């Protein structure tokens, strides 16, 4: 049975008290503050249950970067660059490298015709074409491996104006509402989406044959902003800019992780052991300081050891960011057993048969 | 054929040299600390350290375990009274 | 406690991994096929020439002139889903680990002799163990699926002696990778 | 797996008095577990939970808090212990208002690692290489203005309240359960 | 795994510039660390194969400044994942003498102050002058909270009356309770003599000692060091150390006339032979290079064990910050020449 | 690891119906759960 | 000490699958067909 | 304790993986690429 009585009062009394800093000043490197606490009549208090509450703003600099690896086209091989084109003399001609993923139906005088509308009363399904904005996407393609190699198909690469970058670790901010990257230039307003359609036919049939040249490929040239905020080039062919044929081989690797933060136990957040900004606690009756300290009372390390000494340490506590510095032991000392290099592995063709031979 | 090389590593700790007569943690205060001879006069101290070489400038951190204490009393309402003490060195004033 | 280790007394009891002696096979997660790609990404390409469409004041839609005005005719372009190769990953690791760490210690009576080599007549010679060939198919990945079970072939074998015992590895590495090694040990009196 | 979803609770006897009575709580009228935007800022451990509730729970489970807080002893912290089931989490995402080029982008129009993975289903890859558009930047020299929000996670334990003078566990039979002013007559109960 | 974890954290005297890539001249900026390159094949799978062994250089690098630090990951993730965040934190009271002091009724003035420098307030995994990379901070407000206990007025008054009498005051002490002095070791130095003028020696207990890196120790006294540039863990205020192997031998003397252990107590009546080099008296043990005397000394001083043989200490009595938990001997084989 | 261990337990309302295959009608049948598919884009490593 | 003892028969059902992955040509390419032949017009 | 098992009363308490409840994100460490090679090694070739 619990104790009967004479433990708790019955006149009203707060269970928690909050106090405002009467005095606050700030300098170049530090700021000082001072409060007037009051322990009231017939009220008694233990100091251990007092702390400070601090709120504010911070920026961890630009270099902060928690994750390793990178998150912009990670799976792609480190070599292959994006579709592009560039200039080259024999007094100046264009060379183009590109891949067109989607097969349509039939080309037109202005733009590839994807599907047809629904025929109606005198409404026989007007030939519905693409939509520069984005109609051609960057992921569609023939579903299965037995592709029929349709006679028409498109893709897209941007102008030679934008500098060339490797596909791995490449990002561009959307500008079109419905997911289409492209620089919107001003023309009495942002209305202009300067996209230029280009047509392409087989080289030999474009040289000379029994017919007028016949395009089978449609390309959409456009322009976007580019950046690789998490990766840097690893090998540079030349030391110059202005993308050329060689620079098609440029490759990059991600930047190292960065893990800045608040050191344990907010160590250093408050001054101690330094006769410069010596803290004060006293009775308001007179200016008579109680807290006197020296230059050598290394309270930090002592308090750390003591906090260890009274219980377990492994568990972390989020009340005051209580968590010790850790490191895997294998990193410091390796145990190189080797590996298990038994029956090897293989990769195979997507259809499962390399090449048959009509018989 | 080849040779042999043995090393070790012991981090996240600091070594100790107790001031006993037997290097034993018998109590919170050494018997020697209570022996008269090292208690009734003054004596010079000298130490020698020899360590493996290293390039960049470094530091040697020395801890002297001692008694550091404080007594606090309140005579009346709204008064706090404090007296600290470190064992062997100095503080404040003695007039 | 016996778990913790002490050097000077060679304090380590031989321990065998639990799951090695008793397998709990569950398959893997194999819903995404893994793809490897050409070093340049797009494998093959054909040669193409730029073509600037005709003026086409009538019935000249695809009709087009050569755009050689500003373009080399040696363009490289690919069409279709790009070439690549397929592989599974986790199933293969699982199979490799199974084969090594269980198969390599089957009872000898089930592994036959090799061919075009020399294997010592003496059963216990190291070369003898290193030379017999044992068919992996017996312990293939799909063995007693969804079964917390022990291989009765492996049962009466002594699982303490193995190549995954931390105690033996510790007492080995204590004396380094080598062949001509000195040692500076001490030993305790053990009579009660 | 739901206990984190509660918003607030209120008590009364005979439509008369808020249960804490004397001003023992910063909000005597109603209890308060988690808050929306809080000018006072009573949330601790970086979570969004009002501190007084943390104090109440700590006392009511382990009689700890009147003289500060610290990790409870191992044996007292059982398996269904409050403290074993506390996870404060937070994140920061991209504001729409303070930023200009923000664009709401449904899944259909989104591309990352295009040309190396299936489209809306795990089949063979398709597409051409292209810089992505979904994963917004949150680091480096070109990040975007942001807004931060946070929540907590708890589960596999129970919210509890003792009918004590100061919430401690001072014996099996409580004290207020004895008090003849509130333990010798009849009253009704209402909660919200 | 090996290449990443080890190779990306090696000493800088094995790193050269990359061709055709602009790289800042500063030896501290993040880009300088990232862009500097180092050869993979240096540490590939053919290294010491077969050895619970650690690489030579790594013995003198600061391991805790890293990215495997689960604790550092915990703290930083707590914050989140952004270049800008506000915060809502608490801070406990450090000082020992007033940590658990029992207060009494009155009206008391309290006052303190805090640093604003990024370097001390912050602690990065890599290590770079934040003041160059422009990490920002600002304190909006500060409130002070405290808790009470709804006692009984009669009981509280009786307790106060029994407390205020000067027969029963409060007493406190620090948990470490040691004097701390630091001395400099110049470049490639090996020998340090230290002196203390004649003074009383009443009530002394013994010594502790370690070694630190001059670059990673802020100075006392000053409210801010302009010439301070490092933002990893701070051993003088964290408890992490690594230079223990560097200690070789130490000797004591009073009045330049007597060795402290005095009469015959150890193998060496002259100094603490911590780790002997390759020599043939058979004086080390446990396959390490540490002499029996020092090992026994530490064992006794931590557990009063050694006059009754040896064994493993008890787990509960032992701790994370113990001698025995963090001691590893190793050995390896290398090409004769 | 992510795709399986997280994606394949999302609430039904975010996963559509398959095409050109048979499928049951009761929303609790085993085959209902198995034959439902969902885009692998929502929990790829390019997230949080 | 006391406790009941029950012995009997149970059928788990045709919707049971204790293991992840699949157990028939595990390493088979996710799309590769096998030896087959099929009809077609002229 | 309830963290161990016992056949006698079908005794084992269900649980869940920690990381599934709240995932983490650190990317990975992938500086060194990985390569497949032709079974012979040189594949292509040219009479000489
Ligand atoms: Ca050709």
TrEMBL record, chain B:
Annotated coiled-coil segments of the chain: none
Q: What induces it?
A: Expressed in the late phase of the viral replicative cycle.
Organism listed in the record:
Human adenovirus C serotype 6 (HAdV-6)
Q: What does this protein do?
A: Major capsid protein that self-associates to form 240 hexon trimers, each in the shape of a hexagon, building most of the pseudo T=25 capsid. Assembled into trimeric units with the help of the chaperone shutoff protein. Transported by pre-protein VI to the nucleus where it associates with other structural proteins to form an empty capsid. Might be involved, through its interaction with host dyneins, in the intracellular microtubule-dependent transport of incoming viral capsid to the nucleus.
| Post-translational modification Phosphotyrosine, affected residues | 84
**Portion of the full sequence shown:** 868 to 962 of 963
Name of encoding gene: Hexon
For this protein's source organism, the top of the classification is: Viruses, Varidnaviria, Bamfordvirae, Preplasmiviricota, Polisuviricotina
Give the family from UniProt: Belongs to the adenoviridae hexon protein family.
The name of this protein is Hexon protein
Task: Cite the record's note on assembly.
Answer: Homotrimer. Interacts with the capsid vertex protein; this interaction binds the peripentonal hexons to the neighboring penton base. Interacts with the hexon-linking protein; this interaction tethers the hexons surrounding the penton to those situated in the central plate of the facet. Interacts with the hexon-interlacing protein; this interaction lashes the hexons together. Interacts with host dyneins DYNC1LI1 and DYNC1I2; this interaction might be involved in intracellular microtubule-dependent transport of incoming viral capsid.
Question: What's in the misc comment field?
Answer: All late proteins expressed from the major late promoter are produced by alternative splicing and alternative polyadenylation of the same gene giving rise to non-overlapping ORFs. A leader sequence is present in the N-terminus of all these mRNAs and is recognized by the viral shutoff protein to provide expression although conventional translation via ribosome scanning from the cap has been shut off in the host cell.
Compartments where found: Host nucleus; Virion
């Amino acid at each position: 049975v619990a104790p009967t009585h004479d433990v708790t009062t019955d006149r009203s009394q707060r269970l928690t008290l909050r106090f405002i800093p009467v005095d606050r000043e700030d300098t170049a490197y530090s700021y000082k503050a001072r409060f007037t606490l009051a322990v009231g009549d017939n009220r008694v208090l233990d100091m251990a249950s007092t702390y400070f509450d601090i709120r504010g703003v911070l920026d961890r600099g630009p270099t902060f970067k928690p994750y390793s690896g990178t998150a912009y086209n990670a799976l792609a091989p480190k070599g292959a660059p994006n579709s592009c084109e560039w200039e080259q003399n024999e007094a100046k001609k264009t060379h183009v490298y590109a891949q067109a993923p989607l097969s349509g139906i039939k080309i037109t005088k202005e733009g590839l015709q994807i599907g047809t509308a629904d025929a109606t009363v005198a409404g026989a399904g007007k030939e519905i074409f693409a939509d520069k904005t984005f109609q051609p996407e960057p992921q569609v393609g023939e579903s299965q491996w037995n592709e029929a190699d349709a006679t028409a198909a498109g893709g897209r690469v941007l102008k030679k104006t934008t500098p060339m970058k490797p596909c791995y670790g490449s990002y561009a901010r959307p500008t079109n509402s419905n997911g289409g990257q492209g620089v919107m230039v001003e023309q009495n307003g942002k209305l202009e989406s300067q996209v230029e359609m280009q047509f392409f036919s087989t080289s030999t049939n474009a040289t000379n044959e029994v017919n007028n040249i016949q395009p089978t490929v449609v390309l959409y040239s456009e322009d976007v902003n580019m950046e690789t905020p998490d990766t840097h080039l690893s090998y540079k062919p030349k030391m110059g800019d202005k993308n050329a044929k060689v620079m098609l081989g440029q490759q990059a690797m991600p930047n190292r992780p960065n893990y800045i933060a608040f050191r344990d136990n907010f160590i250093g957040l408050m001054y101690y052991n330094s006769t410069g900004n010596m803290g004060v606690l006293a009775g308001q009756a007179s200016q008579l300081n109680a807290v006197v300290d020296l230059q050598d009372r290394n309270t930090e390390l002592s308090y750390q050891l003591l906090l260890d000494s009274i219980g377990d340490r492994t568990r972390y506590f989020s009340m005051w960011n209580q968590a010790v510095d850790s490191y895997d032991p294998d990193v410091r000392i390796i145990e190189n057993h080797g590996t298990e290099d038994e029956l090897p592995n293989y990769c195979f063709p997507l259809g499962g048969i390399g090449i048959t031979d009509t018989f | 054929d080849s040779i042999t090389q043995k090393k070790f590593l012991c981090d996240r700790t600091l070594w100790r040299i107790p001031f006993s007569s037997n290097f034993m943690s018998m109590g919170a205060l050494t018997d020697l600390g209570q022996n008269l001879l090292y208690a009734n006069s003054a004596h010079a101290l000298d130490m020698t350290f020899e360590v493996d070489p290293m390039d960049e400038p470094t530091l040697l951190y020395v801890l002297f375990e001692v008694f550091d204490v404080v007594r606090v009393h309140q005579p009346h309402r709204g008064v706090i009274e404090t007296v600290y003490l470190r064992t062997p060195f100095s503080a404040g004033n003695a007039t | 406690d016996r778990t913790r280790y002490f050097s000077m007394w060679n304090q380590a009891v031989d321990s065998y991994d639990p799951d090695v002696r008793i397998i709990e096979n569950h398959g893997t997660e194999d819903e995404l096929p893994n793809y490897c790609f050409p070093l340049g990404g797009i494998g093959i390409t054909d040669t193409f020439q730029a073509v600037k469409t005709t003026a086409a004041n009538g019935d000249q839609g695809n009709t087009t002139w050569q755009k050689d005005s500003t373009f080399a005719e040696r363009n490289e372009i690919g069409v279709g889903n790009n070439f690549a190769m397929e592989i599974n990953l986790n199933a293969n690791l699982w199979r490799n680990f199974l084969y090594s760490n269980i198969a390599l210690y089957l009872p000898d009576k089930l592994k036959y002799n090799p061919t075009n080599v020399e294997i010592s007549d003496n059963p216990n010679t190291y070369d003898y163990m290193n030379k017999r060939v044992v068919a992996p198919g017996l312990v293939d990945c799909y063995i007693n699926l969804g079964a917390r079970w022990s291989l009765e072939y492996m049962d009466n074998v002594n699982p303490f002696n193995h190549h995954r015992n931390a105690g033996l590895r510790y007492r080995s590495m204590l004396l380094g990778n080598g062949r001509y090694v000195p040692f500076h040990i001490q030993v305790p009196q053990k009579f009660f | 797996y739901l206990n984190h979803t509660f918003k607030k609770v209120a008590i009364t006897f005979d439509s008369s008095v808020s249960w804490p009575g004397n001003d023992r709580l910063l909000t005597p009228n109603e209890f308060e577990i988690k808050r929306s935007v809080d000018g006072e800022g009573y949330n601790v451990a970086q979570c969004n939970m009002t501190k007084d509730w943390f104090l109440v729970q700590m006392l009511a489970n382990y009689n700890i808090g009147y003289q500060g807080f610290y990790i409870p002893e191992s044996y007292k912290d059982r398996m269904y212990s409050f403290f074993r089931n506390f996870q404060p989490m937070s994140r920061q995402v991209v504001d729409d208002t303070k930023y200009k080029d923000y664009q709401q982008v449904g899944i259909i129009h989104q591309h990352n690692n295009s040309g190396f993975v299936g489209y809306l289903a795990p089949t063979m890859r398709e597409g051409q290489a292209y810089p992505a558009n979904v994963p917004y930047p949150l680091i480096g020299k070109t990040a975007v203005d942001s807004i931060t929000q946070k929540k907590f996670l708890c589960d596999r334990t129970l919210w509890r309240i003792p009918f004590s003078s100061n919430f401690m566990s001072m014996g099996a039979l409580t004290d207020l359960g004895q008090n003849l002013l509130y333990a010798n007559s009849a009253h009704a109960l209402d909660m919200t | 795994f090996l290449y990443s974890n080890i190779a990306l954290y090696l000493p800088d005297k094995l790193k050269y510039n990359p061709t055709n890539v602009e790289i800042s001249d500063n030896p501290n900026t993040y880009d300088y660390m990232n862009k500097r390159v180092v050869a993979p094949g240096l540490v590939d799978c053919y290294i010491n194969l077969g050895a619970r062994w650690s690489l030579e250089y790594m013995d003198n690098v600061n391991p805790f400044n890293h990215h495997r630090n689960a604790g550092l990951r915990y703290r930083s993730m707590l914050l989140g994942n952004g270049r800008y965040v506000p915060f809502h934190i608490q801070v406990p009271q450090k000082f020992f003498a007033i940590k658990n002091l029992l207060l009494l009724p009155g009206s008391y003035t309290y006052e303190w102050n805090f640093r604003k420098d990024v370097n001390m307030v912050l602690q990065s995994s890599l290590g770079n002058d934040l003041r160059v990379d422009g990490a920002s901070i600002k304190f909006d407000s500060i409130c002070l909270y405290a808790t009470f206990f709804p006692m009984a007025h009669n009981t509280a008054s009786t307790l106060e009356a029994m407390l205020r009498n000067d027969t029963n005051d409060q007493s406190f002490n620090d948990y470490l309770s040691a004097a701390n002095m630091l001395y400099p070791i110049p470049a490639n130095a090996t020998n340090v003599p230290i002196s203390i003028p004649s003074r009383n020696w009443a009530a002394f207990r013994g010594w502790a000692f370690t070694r630190l890196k001059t670059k990673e120790t802020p100075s006392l006294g000053s409210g801010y060091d302009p010439y301070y540039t490092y933002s990893g863990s701070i051993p003088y205020l964290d408890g992490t150390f690594y230079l223990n192997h560097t200690f070789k031998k130490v000797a004591i003397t009073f009045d330049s006339s007597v060795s402290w252990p005095g009469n015959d107590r150890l193998l060496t009546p002259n100094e603490f032979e911590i780790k002997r080099s390759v020599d043939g008296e058979g004086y080390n043990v446990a396959q390490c290079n540490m002499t029996k005397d020092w090992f026994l000394v530490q064992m006794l001083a931590n557990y009063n064990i050694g006059y009754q043989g040896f064994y493993i200490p008890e787990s509960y009595k032992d701790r994370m910050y113990s001698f025995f938990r963090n001691f590893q001997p190793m050995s390896r084989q290398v090409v004769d020449d």
